[PDB]
Paper text:
Here, we present structural data for HelD from Mycobacterium smegmatis (Msm) in complex with the RNAP core and provide insights into its function. Next, we provide biochemical evidence showing that in addition to being able to hydrolyze ATP, HelD can also hydrolyze GTP. Finally, we demonstrate that HelD can both prevent binding of the RNAP core to non-specific DNA and actively remove RNAP from stalled elongation complexes. To summarize, HelD clears RNAP of nucleic acids; this likely happens in non-functional (e.g., stalled) transcription complexes or post-termination.
According to the position of the HelD domains within the primary channel (PCh) and active site (AS), we name State I: PCh-engaged, State II: PCh-engaged and AS-interfering, and State III: PCh dis-engaged and AS-interfering. In State I, the other side of the CO-domain, the CO-tip, butts against the three-stranded sheet of the β′ non-conserved domain (β′-NCD) and an α-helix (β′/122–133) of the β′-clamp just preceding it. The only significant ordered part of the PCh-loop in State I, the protruding helix α16 (HelD/451–468), is erected against the β′ three-stranded sheet (β′/1164–1210) and the α16 tip locks behind the helix-turn-helix motif β′/271–304 by HelD/Tyr466. Altogether, the α16 interaction with the β′-clamp might be helping the CO-domain insertion into the primary channel. 1A-1 is connected with the N-terminal domain by the NG-linker (HelD/145–173), which orders only in State I. 1A-2 is then followed by 2A. Notably, helix α3 of the ordered NG-linker in State I covers the putative NTP-binding pocket and partially obstructs the site entrance. State I interactions between α6 and the NTPase site, and α6 and the NG-linker that are NTP-binding prohibitive, are broken in State II and the NTPase site of HelD becomes wide open (NTP-binding permissive). Finally, HelD binding in States I and II also leads to the opening of the RNA exit channel between the β-flap and β′-lid and β′-Zn-finger by about 15 and 21 Å, respectively. The PCh-loop, which is probably flexible in the RNAP-unbound state, folds partially upon binding RNAP (captured in State I), and then it penetrates deep into the primary channel, fully folds, and binds to the AS (captured in States II and III).
Residue numbers in the entry:
A (entry chain E): 24 to 67, 75 to 106
B (entry chain B): 1 to 233
C (entry chain A): 1 to 226
D (entry chain C): 586 to 800, 823 to 1130
E (entry chain D): 440 to 1014, 1024 to 1283
F (entry chain C): 440 to 512
G (entry chain C): 21 to 74
Write the structure that this text describes.
Amino acid sequence: SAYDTPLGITNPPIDELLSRASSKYALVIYAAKRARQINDYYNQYVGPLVEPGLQEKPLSIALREIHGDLLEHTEG
Amino acid sequence: MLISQRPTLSEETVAENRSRFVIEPLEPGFGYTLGNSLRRTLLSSIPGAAVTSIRIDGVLHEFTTVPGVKEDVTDIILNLKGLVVSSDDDEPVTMYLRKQGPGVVTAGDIVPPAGVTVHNPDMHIATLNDKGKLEVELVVERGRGYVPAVQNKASGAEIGRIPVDSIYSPVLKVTYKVEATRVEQRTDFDKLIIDVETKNSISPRDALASAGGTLVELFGLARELNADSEHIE
Amino acid sequence: MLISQRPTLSEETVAENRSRFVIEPLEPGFGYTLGNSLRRTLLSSIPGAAVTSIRIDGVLHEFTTVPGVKEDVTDIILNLKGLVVSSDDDEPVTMYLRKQGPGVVTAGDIVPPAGVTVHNPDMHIATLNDKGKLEVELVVERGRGYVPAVQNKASGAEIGRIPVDSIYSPVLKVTYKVEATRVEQRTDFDKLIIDVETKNSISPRDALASAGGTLVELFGLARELN
Amino acid sequence: PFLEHDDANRALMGANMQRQAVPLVRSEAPLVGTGMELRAAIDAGDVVVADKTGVIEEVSADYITVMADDGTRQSYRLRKFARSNHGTCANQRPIVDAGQRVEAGQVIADGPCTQNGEMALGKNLLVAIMPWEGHNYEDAIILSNRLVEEDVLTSIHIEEHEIDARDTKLGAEEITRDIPNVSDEVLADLDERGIVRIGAEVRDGDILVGKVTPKVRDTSLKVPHGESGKVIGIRVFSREDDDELPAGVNELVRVYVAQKRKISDGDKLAGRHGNKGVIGKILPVEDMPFLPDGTPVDIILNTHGVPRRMNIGQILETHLGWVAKAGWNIDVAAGVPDWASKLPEELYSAPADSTVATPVFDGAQEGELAGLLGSTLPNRDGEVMVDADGKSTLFDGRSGEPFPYPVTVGYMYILKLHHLVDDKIHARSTGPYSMITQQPLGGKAQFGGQRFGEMECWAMQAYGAAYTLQELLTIKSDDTVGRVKVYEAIVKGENIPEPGIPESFKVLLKELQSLCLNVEVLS
Amino acid sequence: QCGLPKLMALELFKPFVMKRLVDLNHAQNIKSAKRMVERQRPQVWDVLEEVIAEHPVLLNRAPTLHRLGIQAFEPQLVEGKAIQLHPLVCEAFNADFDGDQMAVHLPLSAEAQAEARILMLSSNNILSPASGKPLAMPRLDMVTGLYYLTTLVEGATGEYQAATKDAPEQGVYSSPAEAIMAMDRGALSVRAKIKVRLTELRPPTDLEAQLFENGWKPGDAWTAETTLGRVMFNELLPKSYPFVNEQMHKKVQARIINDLAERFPMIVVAQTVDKLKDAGFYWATRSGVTVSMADVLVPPQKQEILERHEAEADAIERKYQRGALNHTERNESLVKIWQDATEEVGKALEEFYPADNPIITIVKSGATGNLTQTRTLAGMKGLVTNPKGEFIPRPIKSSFREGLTVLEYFINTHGARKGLADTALRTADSGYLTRRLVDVSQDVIVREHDCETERGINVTLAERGPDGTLIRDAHVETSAFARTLATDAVDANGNVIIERGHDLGDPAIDALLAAGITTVKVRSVLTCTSATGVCAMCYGRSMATGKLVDIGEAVGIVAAQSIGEPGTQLTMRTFDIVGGLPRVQELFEARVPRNKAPIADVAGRVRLEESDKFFKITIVPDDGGEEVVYDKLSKRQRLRVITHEDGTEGVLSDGDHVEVGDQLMEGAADPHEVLRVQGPREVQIHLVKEVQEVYRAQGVSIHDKHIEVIVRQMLRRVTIIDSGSTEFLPGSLTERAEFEAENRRVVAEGGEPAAGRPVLMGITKASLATDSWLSAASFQETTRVLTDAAINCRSDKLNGLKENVIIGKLIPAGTGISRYRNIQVQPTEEARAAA
Amino acid sequence: LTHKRRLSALGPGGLSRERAGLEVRDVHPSHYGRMCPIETPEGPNIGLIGSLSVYARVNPFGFIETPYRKVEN
Amino acid sequence: NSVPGAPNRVSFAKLREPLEVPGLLDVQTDSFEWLVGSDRWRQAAIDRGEENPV
Ligand SMILES: [Mg+2]
Ligand SMILES: [Zn+2]
């Protein structure tokens, strides 16, 4: 629980995103779909629920969303 | 030669008496150049005061344990080594400490002479036993950096005088770190990150400015020879 | 105890291209890093002058010979690189060399315009026989450190202009010593002793002064913030 | 040197390393070697030996002229910047002066890797045996920047580019200057004939010679990616001139362009004992471990690769290199000590820069070397920078503080290897494909990408990664509409399209429906 | 982080950068931007730190021997023409900076980038997926630094000096920050015994309970008796981790990081190892490790040893010349003599080299090397082989320091060249075994969470030697750890200890060595009664993630690779008696061994007869039936020594007892015998025991669940005998699950179902006896496969990877299975109306 | 110079990587003074290619000779 | 030595070489001489060995 500021791709941490979901691959998909949603928004759509950045690749936006418990995933 | 990018100094506070400064962007090489100089300047070139010796009643020999007090002599020595104290006379000033009777003693129970100040008066010193007490003298003076014990006294005119290591510096810890940076398209520049941990007697900023002043004095003692053909910004 | 004595800087001469400075007294554990900062600023950034490019009558690149000359062009340039000069203008200037017939073209055979000064005119450039003629043009400039050859396609457009690797540093060798001298040991001190050796283009004094100025203007950033 | 102190694998590797070692702009012979470089340099033949005793009449860099003692005048010619079969330079340079009296069998010129007639494949460099701040980890090595400033380990590399002009049904290829619609500046470095002009610097994609196949076309020769430099030479053959040519061909142009290459990071270095490693960090001179003379070291080697490889011969090499670069004088006032017994009366002393020889199995023993590490004449200032054990207290050019422990220092002979960077680096996003297999034209010359074999697929399947594997096997290598659509989607900014149905299946189907197999896909 | 060149990234990221150009108006038409990046104008370098921002890349080094051979990294833009690589992954990539190249792959689609960040990122692939041990741990120089930092010098400067009636302790400090101010004066060695006062570092457990009794808090003071290096080390570890105070041999570091992983997240362990490398590099440059012919020290006793042994050699040769000895027995004795001299010289060398020596420090620190090289260098190379492979009774009584003579240097080239030759055939053999192991698998994906079974295999965890203490088995971190339970633990009193469905690590081992219980039943893949694959609970915890394995994880390839990778570390054939890769190939292929041993078809006692060169055993049973016999037993194979715990049994004798499946002869039983006598489960267990014996004896740690996957797939079918009322032919090979489900769904007239017997196959036949036709059409005869498949109207369920690759469709693993592909994503209602 | 003193056991009339096993790629006590036991490539040509020693020459028949000093009494 | 221009390169050798290293690429030239009956080879043979050098 006690660590230092994760940097770059290490942010957000990963042992937390694994609590939002059931496994690593569910998280992979859970983020990729949100990322495509965001890219389509930015090109044409709920868009980023979180404060974007100068580029802030849509995947990092999606993972911050997930870290804020701003989404929900139902397996298939 | 007009230098490029005019390096700047930014601060980043971490606690009350702890901070982290960042100098960026430095020409490539000027990070390790001045980092260690700054470090040693902060740690041995800012003057300050500190305990130098002590004299307790009861323990002239067998410096093991003190009557009717729970701590040994050694934990008390440490606690007082953590004592923060100023002085304005540059003289082996003397202070006293007595808390006759059981209780708990704190620097707040010290009564210092003129000028001598005590910024950490709640520091724990000892916990007296039922029907116990404490009598001690505190020798204080000024200096720079760190000085181990002094026992260059051939004969003991002051017996029971236990000399203690002396932290005359208001700065307790410093660490520097050089990191790379790109300016426009050339990386391998130098950014310098120096972290400072002081005592409540001074803020980091002030110590950094004092050290800068000292090193300016020195490199001006060098520049005074011809005063020509250097960098400019 | 405390101390009220401030540090002094006394000079000493071992030679004309060399010197030794002494800084004393000093807090203990203070002289090594001080001397190293000076040394780094010396070896790194002391303004100077050096050859920036050359041109020759007949040849068109570094990879061809010159009639009558016993040295190819690359060896000529590698011998020029040991050349020392001193320009007194923040602009590029031009030197000229002209030689005919038998004999050794040294650096003394050059015609430095006013402001420049060739401080090793006994430098072997190239030897010649009864068939040789060496006509050279040099460019000179100011700077610091090491600067690779700015390619001709990048600089002004021309052919025959040969860009070279520039070394703008008059400093040749620096070291430092620390005698932990103590005033009858009553409290430790440090004595710093810098030994400096230059390329004869400028004296040590000037170099130590340039280092001092650099470090003043640097530590002024810690000075400023109050 | 010191072979019986190495192991056969590392000696094998050292041998096969010397054999791959580029010639440098300036050659320097081993301060510590074996009595075998002179004779090798003679017998090979890249030097010039005096046919007959005589007297040096004339000397240039292209010609040497000896008027012999019998009356005849021989005239040797020298090869200058001659491309080998491997891009090297074979430049020769004389080492004699006019009026000199040469015997027969005497070296008149040096070669690419000789100095006064003895192999100089490398350089003597000041080396410190120590771990630095993690930049000499697992066989990597650290360099000063004096080896770049003073172009110590700099090499010249020449390269050849040929274009043929032949006949064709549609017409005849005619090499010219003019060309269909292109720039007007690109013809700057092109002479009246369409061939690039000597003394001109060039750059990838730029034009060397202009050729055409009718239509008309722009069939010009251009520099390949990476390689660059200065035009040395043009060797042009013509049907008309009648020199010689093959069949179907009418004209031929060879271009020779050179490249001076300073030692960068990624380049490979080695010594004669099986000790190689790429260059991790090229450090400024002011942050290198310098000596109590002010003398920085030139190369830093780690301690961890020596004792598990049994190549200690380089340690002894290093020590003797010191002993030589700094001469010696045994004090025989009372008599030759108990460790100079076997020594000649010629090694009892020597000045600085005193080359020596330690033949492989009749060479410097260890008592002799430990003793000669003490003699080791003082320096310019009367101080011995190196102990009687090979170790010198050093100083850090970053902290300025000395390292707490003395460090083995010396002079070692190292070598720069043909395994450079520019000739081993590659990268691709989308380029030429095969047109016989629908895959990139795999090759450094064809600008082909890297392969993704079975074991990589195995690893990827074991990660569970399944969209990247499909991305590699379909979108990147064989698929055609996929590559197009992905390049477009990325250059436009629209999310990547998703798979359709595998295209290695939408057609395989159409082969089993041909054998009248009713393959059906169902839920 | 990875450092990537600029004129390399540029090419990789040409499209993204053309996009950011035509968007940022540095170029008008994408062709202008392509021309720009083609001549590389000075404006295509200020955006490349925008696209590179968190867009990982995959680094690959061939040969790719296992998973970690591909790893994802974030690019840091450096100038040059080489790739900057982290010194901690190199042990996984198996890299060295001596000319080694490496490949860079860029992922494009969102799914790919996410897989790279979340699965293939190096900060997460810390642990071996073979034993659970760390690979991104401190390497050579780091170990030297941390072994210098954390070691104790009795006699140093600045140490605690035992107050003497005149002065106090004299070696005590109120904080690290003060011992550092001392260090920088000369008063304190960083390796000296001192007393410090610590507030931010958690004491050990003994003291944390002996001084606080209510819970240590950050800011509470205690007084540690340590060095300053151990302190500055324990400042690199997490805030809560107890103070260690131990020399940091590489084993200790492995321990500490194992604990961090078993107790903390994995981002913390990444940060910690990063700190440790930084500090070990600092303190290796400042350690004093450097070679010098002085530092290389020669024992003085060497001469006495060599002459004492040359005396015995003289004696031998005297015999030889006297006729009491032949020319081979002589060489055998000479070898057995000059093999001990090397032992003695190495012992002396160990007892003569100080500890402050660098050549002994780099060894004993566990950084690199060993003492055999140290002997070869300062002692004596000893004996050497001939090109045949035998020995040479003339040893090498000289070191590489003294200097080998000409002949010595000649007879030492033989083995060297033999090695440089063999070292490709070795790779090829390992790769062949791996190819097989991978082909038999490709259908063993994890498909469900639990099978709801109690079936399991029993595992021993300890044994009582003196009979009053239980002794913890050695290979229990391979047999018991990481597994999942099937039966609640119980003691002689009937008290429960651990729960069912529980992971089983050191905690549970400790807490099961309490009740005197040693044999606990565990779950395994050998028993997972699942339709396709295995349940995540029978498998256990994934050794990478350290937690329970996920759904869709390809665990057959993982086992294949974990067994292949160490294959080069094994003895091989001459290019059984030498049980290395040959034995593994002899087991995974179910081959009858050369030194076959017969087993007991029955229990009971033995009547042992022996005649010239032959044994005959007769097993009189205990039930009272027919005794069996084993008659033509080559006395070459001696017998089955037992070496019982007590009494020193020795050999198997007459009147002794025999359990079923017991072995009578020393050697190697025949799997098919075991199969018919004992049964399938015991076959599987025997095979795993044998394989792991092979490996263990050769220093390789493979958790038995991999062996179990492969074995499971080797006993995964039945030969039908009596069709019953089923759509089955006799003599056919049918998969046991289909067979169970068919003869189980047949309940209508369920009075005579299909009969079948198990069959033990190999990992190459079992790959021919596959149910798909795409795979088998890619391997073997296409036209006949397609013919047979088409007449039977076959269906390919696409349960595997091979056929999915062939088609070009996603794979049924990880991010390929329906559970995941079709996940629906929606913002919450709360955070939707926040627009 | 080592290309010219090279000995190949591969080429027209020689052998190939099939027959080329591990006893032709070995060092033999008949190489002392005739073939170098060290100089040879590291990969698939280990032991086949070699290099001729310095004091060695070649019989007219084709057998390599090395010199020895003669010793009497 | 045995070479006129011999940069003095001191030696730790303790033995004397009774046989100077031969030409190092004679293995090539001698063989190509035997192939064209050059007179050097013809005499080299006659000087020791057979009488009709073929
Ligand atoms: Mg390698
Ligand atoms: Zn199961």
